[PDB]
């Protein structure tokens, strides 16, 4: 023939991916990536965080010195893992404001204990019980000293322990609540009285309450656990007439990244910066749907099971160009040219516009993958007991956070998918306009994304057009002859 | 010559700035403004808000009547500033749920106190101590009445104080905890007993707990501070046999905008709506990176040190037009024309498209500047003690709020920058298309943002084109003869 057709177009695939946009809920694209991590490995990693496996021991049991927890003395951790199988196997006890002590120690991150010599004169020391069997012998909590009368006298104690160090000291102590009056006389030889433990800043006074309680491990009595924090320069004074479960020393308090998690997942040999109750997860994707309880550099928890971010063009699967459909036969690039001339048909990709679109997509992906925010100690998110308004507030705060981050994830994905599509349409239009301006008056736009070139144009001519070296003037007279018949 | 070139383009600057967009972490723009207020003035200004400088007093010390806080009697404030240098210089005391009373009074915003005549017969009023020296004489808290025995008798008190007002009455009272039993007999001539303070809607019963405590200012005894709120129509009844630190009257509880802040910044003289612990800050920028603790019409706190909002076009630094580069030699506007014809070179800015782009940018700026959210009383954000579960929840709530607002700020700035660039590129394209349409068939698009005008065209026709008065019919025959060789 005496003319040639040069069509511009873009790639397509046999089976694309459906993504969401602001304007179109289900737009088919050539490629997409998942931004929600929906599965875990099933194992907690030993690295990079120090993991202390509580096994049968709860954090409080380790703190008090339950004999089964002897292996946890003076341990440190970044994350303490509490197992659902843990149980107490020592003298029955309770802790007023248990959650606060558990959080306090979990965030401290250490069970390092320093023994101190308290005067404890006129009373006996190291009381034991058949409930706490250590090495086939009656014992007691390893960090507590159960004081009893000496020779049927228990003189009032007024014991001073100054804090001459540069750190806060955590003292754990308790009060014994005997089952009956005979136990009170047998152990203390007098009425319950009261125990006052004080510092310059605060005081705590606890009275024993004699009475029968349901037997736990055949013990009808209870020990209540109290704690106090002694600041540098302060003094701990213990004023007691009986029923005192004395401290044996102090625990250190540190600031840090330590926390406690409840999980039955096994601990394996792996390296992951994000630990969940379901095991560690990858932290590459900006969002996760595995759990709301996280430690470390974890993706934000969202409700969506999946969020797909377009990383490609509208698919529009199937001469004609981009106006009618995409080209399923392209494998070299995303944008390109197809032609029909005097030699035959052909096709070549336009690699500069393909790379420009890819670089813009790479830009969008860079701002999401590997930008994970790191969090450590947080509120409790799961509860086993009904408590009251504080639990309701903690649940409300977590649900609010989840709803807002799920909204942000949905809006972010819809906006980025809309911009990815608009950019790839823009690149197609820029290539079309570039070709039209280069051809100028030597070709007409046929309305299907193709140009009709009104002159003989061989493969070198088409290649010259594709690579930006077409010389407009060389063919102008011939084209005008064909276009207008002079 | 027989042909003129008319090029269109936009300005550029030798050195632009870098902003973030949806697509590009680093896009160079001609101008950008800072939306994060990263520094304070260093002073807390005394207006528009009423500020009461606590000096050496805490709010509770001023509430109780510590001898050093006499200058704070019956004061009101919008913001109470508590200094890190404040210390107690009176009888040692503790407040169960201290944070709640401090918040309660800070929210009320006043120390206005009305005295009431309580019967207090059979006891000695106005007890004093060497710990509280007021005028080189032993004293006690100015708002408390330390009652002791009269003639070695302390009859049971049953004292009624009806609330016949239309507002809530705040009563501050306490319980004496003697160091020894000898002090209990000396002061009250009898056993500790218990103190019950009640209203129709409530009751509080507190037992004295005699025992030695670490001496604070040489006092081994302590006073516990309790408060009660009496609603209109209710009755305050105090039933006590000893150890009572009686009220002298009541404080008003009012609603308002009052709060308390901890800051060592000097108090300055200016008008600044936003006060932070680091001093007052400007509230023009939508975001701040100064502190977490705020009062007044403050910008939202974000974690970014800087967020730059584009206020100009892509720089595209270096006849030819927009497609190849920008024009660094244009200083009279943002858009314009360059000419090359039979007379020589020329250049003139198009001020209408410059103003349209500026108006759109000014719209975005007006939507983002001076639109702060005024907040007053809020939760405590910094803590000096390890408290447990409640403190952890307060920290979690603030961390969640900050992360969500930082996300919103980052997304908003990226969104505004992408829209600013897209709008000014669209305006450039509108000017190019308007020129092309005006030229009709008398010119060709050369592919670099320039038109080849196929006729002799002096400065008068160029000016006609620039101002929209070019008549293509008068030049049609010449343009067609040169362009198509008729």
């Amino acid at each position: 023939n005496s003319t040639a057709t040069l069509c511009l177009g873009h790639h397509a695939v046999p089976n694309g991916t459906i993504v969401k946009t602001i304007t179109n809920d289900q737009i088919e694209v050539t490629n997409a990536t998942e931004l929600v991590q929906s599965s875990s490995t099933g194992e907690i990693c030993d690295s990079p965080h120090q993991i202390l496996d509580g096994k049968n021991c709860t954090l409080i049991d380790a703190l008090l010195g339950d004999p089964q927890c002897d292996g946890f003395q003076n341990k440190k951790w970044d994350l303490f893992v509490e197992r659902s199988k843990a149980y107490s196997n020592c003298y029955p006890y309770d802790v007023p404001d248990y959650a606060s002590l558990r959080s306090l120690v979990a965030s401290s991150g250490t069970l390092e204990f320093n023994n101190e010599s308290f005067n404890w004169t006129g009373v006996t020391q190291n009381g034991t019980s058949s409930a706490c069997i250590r090495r086939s012998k009656n014992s007691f909590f390893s960090r507590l000293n159960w004081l009893t009368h000496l020779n049927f006298k228990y003189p009032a104690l007024n014991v001073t322990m100054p804090n001459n160090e540069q750190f806060d000291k955590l003292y754990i102590w308790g009060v014994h609540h005997p089952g009956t009056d005979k136990d009170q006389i047998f152990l203390y030889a007098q009425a319950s009285g009261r125990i006052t433990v004080s510092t310059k800043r605060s005081q705590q006074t606890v009275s024993p309450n004699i009475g029968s309680r349901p037997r736990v491990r055949n013990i009808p009595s209870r020990i209540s656990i109290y704690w106090t924090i002694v600041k540098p320069g302060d003094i701990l004074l213990i004023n007691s007439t009986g029923n005192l479960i004395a401290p044996r020393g102090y625990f250190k308090i540190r600031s840090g990244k330590s926390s406690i998690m409840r999980s039955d997942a096994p601990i394996g040999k792996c390296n992951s910066e994000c630990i969940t109750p379901n095991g560690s997860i990858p932290n590459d994707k900006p969002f996760q749907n595995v759990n709301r309880i996280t430690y470390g550099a974890c993706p934000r928890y969202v409700k969506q099971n999946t969020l797909k971010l377009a990383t490609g063009m509208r698919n529009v699967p199937e001469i004609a160009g981009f106006i009618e459909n995409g080209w399923e036969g392209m494998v070299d690039g995303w944008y390109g040219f197809r032609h029909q001339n005097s030699e035959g048909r052909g096709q070549a990709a336009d690699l500069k516009s393909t790379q420009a679109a890819i670089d813009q997509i790479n830009g969008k992906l860079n701002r999401l993958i590997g930008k994970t925010n790191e969090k450590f100690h947080q509120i409790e998110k799961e509860f086993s007991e009904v408590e009251g308004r504080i639990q309701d507030l903690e649940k409300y705060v977590e649900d609010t956070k989840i709803d807002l981050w799920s909204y942000n994830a949905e809006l972010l994905v819809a906006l980025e998918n809309q911009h990815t599509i608009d950019l790839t349409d823009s690149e197609m239009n820029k290539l079309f306009e570039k070709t039209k301006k280069q051809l100028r008056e030597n070709a007409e736009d046929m309305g299907n994304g193709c140009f009709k070139i009104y002159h003989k144009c061989d493969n070198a001519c088409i290649g010259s057009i594709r690579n930006g070296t077409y010389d407009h003037d060389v063919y102008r007279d011939e084209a005008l002859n064909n276009r207008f018949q002079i | 010559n027989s042909t003129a070139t008319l090029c269109l383009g936009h300005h550029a600057v030798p050195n632009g700035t870098i902003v973030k967009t949806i697509t590009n972490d680093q896009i160079e723009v001609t101008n950008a403004t800072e939306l994060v207020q990263s520094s304070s003035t260093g002073e807390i200004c005394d207006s528009p808000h009423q500020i009461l400088d606590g000096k050496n007093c805490t709010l509770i010390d001023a509430l109780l009547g510590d001898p050093q806080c006499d200058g704070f009697q019956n004061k009101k404030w919008d913001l109470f500033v508590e200094r890190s240098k404040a210390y107690s210089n009176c009888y040692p005391y503790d407040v169960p749920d201290y944070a709640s009373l401090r918040s309660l009074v800070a929210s009320s915003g006043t120390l206005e106190f009305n005295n009431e005549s309580f019967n207090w017969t059979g006891v000695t009023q106005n007890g004093t101590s060497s710990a509280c020296i007021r005028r080189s004489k032993n004293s006690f808290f100015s708002r408390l009445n330390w009652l002791t025995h009269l003639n070695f008798k302390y009859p049971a008190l049953n004292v009624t104080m009806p609330n016949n007002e239309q507002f809530d009455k705040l009563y501050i009272w306490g319980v004496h905890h003697p160091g020894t039993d000898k002090d209990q007999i000396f002061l009250y001539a009898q056993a500790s007993g218990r103190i019950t303070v009640s209203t129709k809607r409530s009751q509080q019963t507190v037992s004295p707990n005699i025992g030695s405590r670490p001496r604070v200012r040489n006092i081994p005894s302590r006073i516990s501070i309790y408060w009660t709120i009496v609603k209109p129509g209710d009755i305050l009844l105090i039933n006590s046999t000893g150890n009572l630190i009686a009220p002298r009257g009541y404080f008003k509880i009012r609603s308002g905008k009052s709060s308390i802040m901890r800051s060592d910044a000097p108090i300055g003289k200016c008008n600044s709506e936003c006060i932070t612990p680091n001093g007052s800050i400007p509230n023009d920028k939508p975001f701040q990176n100064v502190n977490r603790i705020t009062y007044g019409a403050c910008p939202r706190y974000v974690k970014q040190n800087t967020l730059k909002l584009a206020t100009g076009m892509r720089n595209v630094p270096e006849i030819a037009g927009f497609i190849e580069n920008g024009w660094e030699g244009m200083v009279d506007g943002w858009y314009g024309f360059r000419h090359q014809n039979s007379e020589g070179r020329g250049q003139a800015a198009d001020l209408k498209s410059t103003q349209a782009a500026i108006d759109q940018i000014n719209g975005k700026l007006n939507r983002l500047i001076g639109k702060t959210n005024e907040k007053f009383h809020q939760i405590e954000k910094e803590f000096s003690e390890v408290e447990g579960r409640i403190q952890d929840l307060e920290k979690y709530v603030e961390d969640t709020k900050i992360d969500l607002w930082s996300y919103n700020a980052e997304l908003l700035v990226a969104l505004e920058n992408q829209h600013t660039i897209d709008l000014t590129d669209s305006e450039m394209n509108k000017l190019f298309e308007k020129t092309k349409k005006q030229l009709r068939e008398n010119a060709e698009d050369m592919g670099n943002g320039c038109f080849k005008i196929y006729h002799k065209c002096d400065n008068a026709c160029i000016g006609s084109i620039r101002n929209g008065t070019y008549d293509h019919d008068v030049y049609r025959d010449e343009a067609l003869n040169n362009r198509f060789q008729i």
Partner: antibody
Amino acid sequence: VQLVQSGAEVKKPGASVKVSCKASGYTFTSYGISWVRQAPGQGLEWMGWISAYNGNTNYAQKLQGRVTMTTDTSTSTAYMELRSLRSDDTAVYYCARGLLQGVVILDSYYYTMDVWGQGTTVTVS
Amino acid sequence: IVLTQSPGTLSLSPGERATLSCRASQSVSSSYLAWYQQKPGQAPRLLIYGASSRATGIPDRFSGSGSGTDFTLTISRLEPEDFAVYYCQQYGSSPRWTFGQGTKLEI
């Protein structure tokens, strides 16, 4: 994967040097080639990058107007011509695999230069 | 941008932990930073891509980290073969790379 550079060159001031870099073990047009100058002492000065996929280039501002980069797909080679050599340009010149091209990058690996040539040791004056 | 090497590990010995670090004049994405080891007489080889990911076969001791404007190589325990010049690389938005001045880690 291997990159093999040309041998040592000795040039007089005012001359140009063209350093080749032959690739083997990976599709040549799937990645760019970056050129880096290691002067005696001193650190690594990046000189430029060329896309084998589409021919695009990027140059260090200090060398704009002086260095021309080109590729040859059939030989899977890249060339860098440095014009108007001065004695300050004596250095070991390395070629390395650059950015991934034609594929969307999700991993951070493909933003680094993970394959380096031997170094040609070009002496000027 | 421009990177400042601020060398802090010029003289170390086997068994010691390296604290070699790099500060950017502007904050950068962690995905665009990398660490390289250049031995005398050899071309640089890539050690760490991103802020903390190991590239090719490498000893487990070469585990780095960082964020924002401050990145650290953190060599867990040095061996004689680890003494080399270490370079901090930053990738920009454009297909351009910049290197720091180089920290020479020697016996």
